[PDB]
Amino acid sequence: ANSKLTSDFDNPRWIGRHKHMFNFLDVNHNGKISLDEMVYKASDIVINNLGATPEQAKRHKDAVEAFFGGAGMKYGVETDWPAYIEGWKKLATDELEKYAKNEPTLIRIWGDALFDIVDKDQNGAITLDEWKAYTKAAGIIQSSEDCEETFRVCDIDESGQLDVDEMTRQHLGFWYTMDPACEKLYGGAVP
């Protein structure tokens, strides 16, 4: 492993980051969300907004399923906030253990599936316009300014593209650890 990455689950900013995403995913404010809703949203984006082929959409669905499944979410089950954050601690712990052992993480698997769809050239890297297209379809980022901040925070290659290796590292830090190097990865869109 190129980094020594550790959890910080009692940091109110960690908890808060995931509460933000919980509230953003709970579009109708039910106080709970299901795996059914998560995989619906994921496939809706890639198939109906981003042009995914059937095989590409299925690969992506599988990776989203396993990601949220790692946080304890299940088909036909409604997950409330207390269960969600409990599951998220397990997910992060498991991911960081795989990382420390140089084994593929669920976030890498998902990234590789998503980048196959989003990168016009299928070479594992995306342009700013492609990042804007994905994030604004998903709604996780709403403004171009915030999408631009992502390219400031990450190490960009000489052609001005964000590669999956770099985005995986940044996401490990941003979602699992509170690495201060990854602050503002989504600009002002996600605290």
CSV table of all heavy atoms in Angstrom, one decimal, residues 120-153:
chain,number,residue,atom,x,y,z
A,120,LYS,N,-14.9,8.4,-22.7
A,120,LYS,CA,-15.2,8.1,-24.2
A,120,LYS,C,-14.1,7.1,-24.7
A,120,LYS,O,-14.5,6.3,-25.6
A,120,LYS,CB,-15.2,9.4,-25.0
A,120,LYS,CG,-15.2,9.3,-26.5
A,120,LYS,CD,-15.2,10.6,-27.2
A,120,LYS,CE,-15.2,10.4,-28.7
A,120,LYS,NZ,-14.9,11.7,-29.5
A,121,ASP,N,-12.9,7.2,-24.3
A,121,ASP,CA,-11.8,6.3,-24.8
A,121,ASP,C,-11.6,5.0,-24.1
A,121,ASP,O,-10.7,4.2,-24.6
A,121,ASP,CB,-10.5,7.1,-24.8
A,121,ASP,CG,-10.6,8.4,-25.6
A,121,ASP,OD1,-11.5,8.4,-26.6
A,121,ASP,OD2,-9.9,9.4,-25.4
A,122,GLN,N,-12.3,4.7,-23.0
A,122,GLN,CA,-12.1,3.5,-22.2
A,122,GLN,C,-10.7,3.2,-21.9
A,122,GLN,O,-10.3,2.0,-21.9
A,122,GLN,CB,-12.8,2.4,-23.0
A,122,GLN,CG,-14.3,2.6,-23.1
A,122,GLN,CD,-15.0,1.5,-23.8
A,122,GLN,OE1,-15.1,1.6,-25.0
A,122,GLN,NE2,-15.4,0.5,-23.2
A,123,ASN,N,-10.0,4.2,-21.5
A,123,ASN,CA,-8.6,4.1,-21.1
A,123,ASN,C,-8.3,4.4,-19.6
A,123,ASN,O,-7.2,4.6,-19.1
A,123,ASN,CB,-7.7,4.9,-22.0
A,123,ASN,CG,-6.2,4.5,-22.0
A,123,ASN,OD1,-5.8,3.4,-21.6
A,123,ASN,ND2,-5.3,5.4,-22.4
A,124,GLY,N,-9.4,4.5,-18.8
A,124,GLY,CA,-9.3,4.7,-17.4
A,124,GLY,C,-9.1,6.1,-17.0
A,124,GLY,O,-8.5,6.4,-15.9
A,125,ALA,N,-9.6,7.1,-17.7
A,125,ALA,CA,-9.4,8.5,-17.3
A,125,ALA,C,-10.5,9.4,-17.9
A,125,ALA,O,-11.0,9.2,-19.0
A,125,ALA,CB,-8.0,9.0,-17.6
A,126,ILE,N,-10.9,10.4,-17.1
A,126,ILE,CA,-12.0,11.2,-17.5
A,126,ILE,C,-11.6,12.7,-17.6
A,126,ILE,O,-10.8,13.2,-16.8
A,126,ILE,CB,-13.3,11.1,-16.7
A,126,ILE,CG1,-13.0,11.5,-15.2
A,126,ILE,CG2,-13.8,9.6,-16.7
A,126,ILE,CD1,-14.3,11.3,-14.3
A,127,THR,N,-12.2,13.4,-18.6
A,127,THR,CA,-12.1,14.9,-18.7
A,127,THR,C,-13.1,15.5,-17.7
A,127,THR,O,-13.9,14.9,-17.2
A,127,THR,CB,-12.6,15.3,-20.1
A,127,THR,OG1,-13.9,15.0,-20.4
A,127,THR,CG2,-11.8,14.7,-21.2
A,128,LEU,N,-12.9,16.9,-17.6
A,128,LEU,CA,-13.8,17.7,-16.8
A,128,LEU,C,-15.2,17.6,-17.3
A,128,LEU,O,-16.1,17.5,-16.5
A,128,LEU,CB,-13.2,19.1,-16.6
A,128,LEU,CG,-14.1,20.1,-15.9
A,128,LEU,CD1,-14.2,19.7,-14.4
A,128,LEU,CD2,-13.6,21.6,-16.0
A,129,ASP,N,-15.4,17.7,-18.6
A,129,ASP,CA,-16.7,17.7,-19.1
A,129,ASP,C,-17.4,16.3,-18.8
A,129,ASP,O,-18.6,16.3,-18.6
A,129,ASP,CB,-16.8,17.9,-20.6
A,129,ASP,CG,-16.6,19.4,-21.0
A,129,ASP,OD1,-16.6,20.3,-20.2
A,129,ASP,OD2,-16.5,19.7,-22.2
A,130,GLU,N,-16.6,15.2,-18.8
A,130,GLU,CA,-17.2,13.9,-18.5
A,130,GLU,C,-17.5,13.8,-17.0
A,130,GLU,O,-18.6,13.3,-16.6
A,130,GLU,CB,-16.2,12.8,-18.9
A,130,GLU,CG,-16.2,12.6,-20.4
A,130,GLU,CD,-15.0,11.8,-20.9
A,130,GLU,OE1,-14.0,11.6,-20.1
A,130,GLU,OE2,-15.0,11.3,-22.1
A,131,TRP,N,-16.7,14.4,-16.1
A,131,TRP,CA,-17.0,14.5,-14.7
A,131,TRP,C,-18.2,15.3,-14.4
A,131,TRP,O,-19.0,14.9,-13.5
A,131,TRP,CB,-15.8,15.0,-13.9
A,131,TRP,CG,-15.9,15.1,-12.4
A,131,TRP,CD1,-15.7,16.2,-11.7
A,131,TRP,CD2,-16.2,14.1,-11.5
A,131,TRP,NE1,-15.8,16.0,-10.4
A,131,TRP,CE2,-16.1,14.6,-10.2
A,131,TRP,CE3,-16.4,12.7,-11.6
A,131,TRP,CZ2,-16.3,13.9,-9.0
A,131,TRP,CZ3,-16.6,12.0,-10.4
A,131,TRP,CH2,-16.6,12.6,-9.1
A,132,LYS,N,-18.4,16.4,-15.1
A,132,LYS,CA,-19.6,17.2,-15.0
A,132,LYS,C,-20.8,16.4,-15.4
A,132,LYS,O,-21.8,16.5,-14.7
A,132,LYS,CB,-19.5,18.5,-15.8
A,132,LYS,CG,-18.4,19.5,-15.4
A,132,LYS,CD,-18.4,20.7,-16.3
A,132,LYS,CE,-17.4,21.8,-15.8
A,132,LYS,NZ,-17.3,23.0,-16.8
A,133,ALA,N,-20.7,15.8,-16.5
A,133,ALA,CA,-21.8,14.9,-17.0
A,133,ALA,C,-22.3,13.9,-15.9
A,133,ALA,O,-23.5,13.8,-15.7
A,133,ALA,CB,-21.5,14.3,-18.3
A,134,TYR,N,-21.4,13.1,-15.4
A,134,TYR,CA,-21.8,12.1,-14.4
A,134,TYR,C,-22.3,12.8,-13.1
A,134,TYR,O,-23.4,12.4,-12.6
A,134,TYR,CB,-20.6,11.2,-14.0
A,134,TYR,CG,-20.9,10.4,-12.8
A,134,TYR,CD1,-21.8,9.4,-12.9
A,134,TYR,CD2,-20.3,10.7,-11.6
A,134,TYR,CE1,-22.2,8.7,-11.7
A,134,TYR,CE2,-20.7,10.0,-10.4
A,134,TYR,CZ,-21.6,9.0,-10.5
A,134,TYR,OH,-22.0,8.3,-9.5
A,135,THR,N,-21.5,13.7,-12.5
A,135,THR,CA,-22.0,14.2,-11.2
A,135,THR,C,-23.3,15.0,-11.3
A,135,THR,O,-24.0,14.9,-10.3
A,135,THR,CB,-20.9,15.0,-10.5
A,135,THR,OG1,-20.5,16.2,-11.4
A,135,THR,CG2,-19.6,14.3,-10.2
A,136,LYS,N,-23.5,15.7,-12.3
A,136,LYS,CA,-24.7,16.5,-12.4
A,136,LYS,C,-25.9,15.6,-12.7
A,136,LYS,O,-27.0,15.9,-12.4
A,136,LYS,CB,-24.6,17.6,-13.4
A,136,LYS,CG,-23.6,18.7,-13.0
A,136,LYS,CD,-23.5,19.7,-14.1
A,136,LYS,CE,-22.6,20.9,-13.7
A,136,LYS,NZ,-22.9,22.1,-14.6
A,137,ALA,N,-25.7,14.5,-13.5
A,137,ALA,CA,-26.8,13.5,-13.7
A,137,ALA,C,-27.2,12.8,-12.3
A,137,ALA,O,-28.4,12.7,-12.0
A,137,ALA,CB,-26.4,12.4,-14.7
A,138,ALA,N,-26.2,12.4,-11.6
A,138,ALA,CA,-26.4,11.8,-10.3
A,138,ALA,C,-27.0,12.8,-9.3
A,138,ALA,O,-27.8,12.5,-8.4
A,138,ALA,CB,-25.0,11.2,-9.8
A,139,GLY,N,-26.6,14.1,-9.5
A,139,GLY,CA,-26.9,15.2,-8.6
A,139,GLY,C,-26.0,15.4,-7.4
A,139,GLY,O,-26.2,16.3,-6.6
A,140,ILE,N,-24.9,14.6,-7.3
A,140,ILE,CA,-24.0,14.7,-6.1
A,140,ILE,C,-23.2,16.0,-6.1
A,140,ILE,O,-22.8,16.5,-5.1
A,140,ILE,CB,-23.0,13.5,-6.1
A,140,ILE,CG1,-22.2,13.4,-4.8
A,140,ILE,CG2,-22.1,13.4,-7.3
A,140,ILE,CD1,-21.5,12.0,-4.6
A,141,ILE,N,-23.0,16.5,-7.3
A,141,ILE,CA,-22.5,17.9,-7.6
A,141,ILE,C,-23.5,18.6,-8.5
A,141,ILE,O,-23.9,18.0,-9.5
A,141,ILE,CB,-21.1,18.0,-8.1
A,141,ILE,CG1,-20.1,17.2,-7.3
A,141,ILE,CG2,-20.7,19.4,-8.3
A,141,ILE,CD1,-18.7,17.2,-7.9
A,142,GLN,N,-23.9,19.8,-8.2
A,142,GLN,CA,-24.9,20.6,-9.0
A,142,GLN,C,-24.2,21.7,-9.8
A,142,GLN,O,-24.6,22.0,-10.9
A,142,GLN,CB,-25.9,21.3,-8.1
A,142,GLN,CG,-26.8,20.4,-7.3
A,142,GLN,CD,-27.8,19.8,-8.1
A,142,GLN,OE1,-28.5,20.4,-8.9
A,142,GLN,NE2,-28.0,18.5,-8.0
A,143,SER,N,-23.1,22.3,-9.3
A,143,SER,CA,-22.5,23.4,-10.1
A,143,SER,C,-21.2,23.1,-10.7
A,143,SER,O,-20.4,22.2,-10.2
A,143,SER,CB,-22.3,24.6,-9.1
A,143,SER,OG,-21.2,24.5,-8.3
A,144,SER,N,-20.9,23.7,-11.9
A,144,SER,CA,-19.6,23.6,-12.6
A,144,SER,C,-18.4,24.0,-11.7
A,144,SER,O,-17.4,23.3,-11.7
A,144,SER,CB,-19.5,24.3,-13.9
A,144,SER,OG,-20.4,23.8,-14.8
A,145,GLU,N,-18.5,25.0,-10.9
A,145,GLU,CA,-17.5,25.4,-10.0
A,145,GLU,C,-17.0,24.3,-9.1
A,145,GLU,O,-15.8,24.1,-8.8
A,145,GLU,CB,-17.9,26.6,-9.2
A,145,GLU,CG,-16.9,27.2,-8.2
A,145,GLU,CD,-17.3,28.6,-7.7
A,145,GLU,OE1,-18.5,28.9,-7.7
A,145,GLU,OE2,-16.4,29.3,-7.2
A,146,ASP,N,-18.0,23.6,-8.5
A,146,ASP,CA,-17.6,22.5,-7.6
A,146,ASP,C,-17.0,21.3,-8.3
A,146,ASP,O,-16.0,20.8,-7.8
A,146,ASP,CB,-18.8,22.0,-6.8
A,146,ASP,CG,-19.3,23.0,-5.8
A,146,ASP,OD1,-18.5,23.9,-5.3
A,146,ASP,OD2,-20.5,23.0,-5.3
A,147,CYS,N,-17.5,21.0,-9.5
A,147,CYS,CA,-16.8,20.0,-10.4
A,147,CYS,C,-15.4,20.3,-10.7
A,147,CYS,O,-14.5,19.5,-10.7
A,147,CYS,CB,-17.6,19.8,-11.7
A,147,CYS,SG,-19.3,19.2,-11.6
A,148,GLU,N,-15.1,21.6,-10.9
A,148,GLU,CA,-13.8,22.1,-11.2
A,148,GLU,C,-12.8,22.0,-10.0
A,148,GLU,O,-11.6,21.7,-10.1
A,148,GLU,CB,-13.9,23.6,-11.7
A,148,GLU,CG,-14.5,23.7,-13.1
A,148,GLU,CD,-15.1,25.0,-13.5
A,148,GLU,OE1,-15.0,26.0,-12.7
A,148,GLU,OE2,-15.7,25.1,-14.6
A,149,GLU,N,-13.4,22.1,-8.8
A,149,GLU,CA,-12.6,22.0,-7.6
A,149,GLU,C,-12.0,20.6,-7.5
A,149,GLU,O,-10.9,20.3,-7.0
A,149,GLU,CB,-13.4,22.4,-6.3
A,149,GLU,CG,-12.4,22.6,-5.2
A,149,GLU,CD,-12.7,23.7,-4.2
A,149,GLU,OE1,-13.9,24.0,-4.0
A,149,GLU,OE2,-11.7,24.3,-3.7
A,150,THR,N,-12.8,19.6,-8.0
A,150,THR,CA,-12.3,18.2,-8.0
A,150,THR,C,-10.9,18.1,-8.7
A,150,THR,O,-10.0,17.4,-8.3
A,150,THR,CB,-13.3,17.2,-8.7
A,150,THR,OG1,-14.6,17.3,-8.1
A,150,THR,CG2,-12.8,15.8,-8.5
A,151,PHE,N,-10.9,18.8,-9.9
A,151,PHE,CA,-9.6,18.7,-10.7
A,151,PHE,C,-8.5,19.5,-10.1
A,151,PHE,O,-7.4,19.2,-10.3
A,151,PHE,CB,-9.9,19.1,-12.2
A,151,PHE,CG,-10.5,18.0,-13.0
A,151,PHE,CD1,-11.7,17.3,-12.6
A,151,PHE,CD2,-9.9,17.6,-14.2
A,151,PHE,CE1,-12.2,16.3,-13.3
A,151,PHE,CE2,-10.4,16.5,-14.9
A,151,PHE,CZ,-11.6,15.9,-14.5
A,152,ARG,N,-8.8,20.4,-9.2
A,152,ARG,CA,-7.8,21.1,-8.4
A,152,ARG,C,-7.2,20.2,-7.3
A,152,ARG,O,-6.0,20.2,-7.0
A,152,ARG,CB,-8.4,22.4,-7.8
A,152,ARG,CG,-7.4,23.2,-6.9
A,152,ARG,CD,-8.0,24.4,-6.1
A,152,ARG,NE,-8.5,24.1,-4.7
A,152,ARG,CZ,-7.9,23.3,-3.8
A,152,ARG,NH1,-6.7,22.7,-4.0
A,152,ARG,NH2,-8.5,23.2,-2.6
A,153,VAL,N,-8.1,19.5,-6.6
A,153,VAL,CA,-7.7,18.7,-5.5
A,153,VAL,C,-6.9,17.5,-5.9
A,153,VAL,O,-5.9,17.1,-5.3
A,153,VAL,CB,-8.9,18.3,-4.6
A,153,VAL,CG1,-8.5,17.3,-3.6
A,153,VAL,CG2,-9.5,19.5,-4.0
